[PDB]
Design a protein around this ligand. Structure first.
Ligand SMILES: COc1cc(/C=C/C(=O)SCCNC(=O)CCNC(=O)C(O)C(C)(C)COP(=O)(O)OP(=O)(O)OC[C@H]2O[C@@H](n3cnc4c(N)ncnc43)[C@H](O)[C@@H]2OP(=O)(O)O)cc(O)c1O
Ligand SMILES: Nc1ncnc2c1ncn2[C@@H]1O[C@H](CSCC[C@H](N)C(=O)O)[C@@H](O)[C@H]1O
Ligand SMILES: Nc1ncnc2c1ncn2[C@@H]1O[C@H](CSCC[C@H](N)C(=O)O)[C@@H](O)[C@H]1O
Ligand SMILES: [Ca+2]
Ligand SMILES: [Ca+2]
Lengths: 227, 227
């Protein structure tokens, strides 16, 4: 499904302004991932498109991605930044990431990726210690945990440079953010919902950012750092 | 009703993300447009936060807006852009712009507008003749008639620079692709739908732009000039 009113309206967007003219690598990678069990987590085609646009408009060169899985967001990012662009990609799994690496290599853009297996927080905390790392990223995409976003934000905010833009994914958490107090939902969406709601409030009240909640994909809250 | 799944989901977006850090008077100017005698149509609360973010992101200074009325997206652009640059607030035909100019003046940002009246189609053709007005606008939002988009795009594409970004409101026309010839839709919509459907197919194929169709309010197609 999607966050729109109908599955046909959403499809219309895909069939008319997304699929036609979409590199191909995305087409491939999207096929590889379709056979994988947890394919429900893969970023949507329209959201990959929005990221591509966004990345181009802000001339992002140096970026970071938390939550890689298979590689869709990554691929999109690597194809959008310049030939000398760099991406610090973090994910706890890694078998998954290599499932799509063949494609990224076939698209000849795997050279921009610096993959690091393991939990993101530790690594983040380490970067924070070196002052030269502060404000060194143009773009940071967070599509991981959820019950860890607020924690990421604490340090991501000093690592994003004023230029800004930090993207939090699934901010509308399958609409469960306004679901009827009596319509049981899957155990995990029920769990992460308290976190997302919590995340949203903190974000809407953070003086250091700008924020915009786009209902593309499962919702991305785009944060522009102002200081 | 919006384009999202529910009305609550849409409100959740406005309650938490918009109204809180919403700009000053955007609520004034929006409660003014509610006083308008014709009520005519859609005045989305989320376009402001979106336009604001997009403009600061692309660092727009020299902008142009075609299609005012009250000036809600105009106020946004005026407040969002810097005190420096100006907004060639192209025009509209009626003076509903008058109906809202006091707020855009009260928020001391009107000193950036260059409002004009009567069809812009002429002004553009005139602007084009000079081989310098070519690619001088950093951003152009078009919320004009509807059947004139295609026509505007013709000239408009020569006036924006590299990224440029041309935006077209209602490009999703409250739900274009509805049930085939058996939908109880007001003739007024079906009439304009046609232009939209074609405005979309056309923009989707133009090889000088990248485009991205966002479900913000009534749909906004962001275009990025590449050639
Ligand atoms: C960063 O990456 C990440 C991303 C994500 C993204 C998650 C997403 O969901 S985004 C969306 C992607 N996939 C999807 O689009 C959706 C997946 N599944 C569905 O949509 C889906 O078809 C469905 C949720 C299972 C169906 O829900 P539903 O709304 O159709 O059904 P329901 O539960 O409300 O059923 C209600 C009715 O069912 C009947 N019912 C009664 N008991 C039951 C029951 N135990 N089960 C089912 N139906 C029941 C009753 O008639 C009930 O009505 P009433 O009047 O309350 O008695 C997670 C991470 O963990 C990450 O890390
Ligand atoms: N603490 C943590 N640190 C790093 N990665 C984590 C993590 N907790 C979960 N993850 C990972 O976050 C991943 C993101 S899945 C969604 C994003 C992906 N770029 C796509 O578009 O397909 C999960 O697959 C999981 O392995
Ligand atoms: N030729 C034209 N030029 C400019 N505005 C026009 C127009 N024809 C109609 N309009 C007005 O354009 C209105 C849409 S205004 C859409 C809202 C958006 N926030 C914005 O302010 O840009 C119509 O309701 C109508 O009354
Ligand atoms: Ca996601
Ligand atoms: Ca409109």
């Amino acid at each position: 499904k999607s966050l729109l009113q109908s599955d046909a309206l959403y499809q219309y967007i895909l069939e008319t302004s997304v699929f036609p003219r979409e590199h191909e690598a995305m087409k491939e990678l999207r096929e590889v991932t379709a056979k994988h069990p947890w394919n429900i987590m893969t970023t949507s085609a329209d959201e990959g498109q929005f990221l591509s646009m966004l990345l181009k408009l802000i001339n992002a060169k140096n970026t970071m991605e938390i939550g890689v899985y298979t590689g869709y967001s990554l691929l999109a990012t690597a194809l959008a930044i310049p030939e000398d662009g760099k991406i610090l990609a973090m994910d706890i799994n890694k078998e998954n990431y290599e499932l799509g690496l063949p494609v990224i290599k076939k698209a000849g853009v795997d050279h921009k990726i610096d993959f690091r297996e393991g939990p993101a927080l530790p690594v983040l905390d380490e970067m924070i210690k070196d002052e030269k790392n502060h404000g060194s990223y143009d773009f940071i995409f967070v599509d991981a945990d959820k019950d860890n976003y607020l924690n990421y934000h604490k340090r991501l905010i000093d690592l994003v440079k004023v230029g800004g833009v930090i993207g939090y994914d699934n901010t509308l958490w399958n609409g469960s953010v306004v679901a009827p107090p009596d319509a049981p939902l899957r155990k995990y969406v029920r769990y992460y919902r308290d976190f997302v709601l919590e995340l949203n409030k903190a974000l809407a009240v953070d003086p250091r950012i700008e924020i915009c909640m786009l209902p593309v994909g499962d919702g991305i809250t785009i944060c522009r750092r102002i200081k």
